[PDB]
């Protein structure tokens, strides 16, 4: 995954979700499928 994809902790489930600020997209589910 591109450098812009960070693994960041999400509020509700306490989950490690992938946040990307280059696309500004946010995926709890895996970006690569």
């Amino acid at each position: 995954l591109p450098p812009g994809w960070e693994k960041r902790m999400s509020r509700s489930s306490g989950r490690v979700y992938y946040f990307n600020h280059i696309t500004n997209a946010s995926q709890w589910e895996r970006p690569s499928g």
Binding site: S10, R11, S12, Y17, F19, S26, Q27, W28, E29
Partner: peptide, 8 residues
């Protein structure tokens, strides 16, 4: 405050 809905 910024928390995502899951794509599934």
């Amino acid at each position: 405050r910024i928390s995502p809905p899951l794509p599934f």
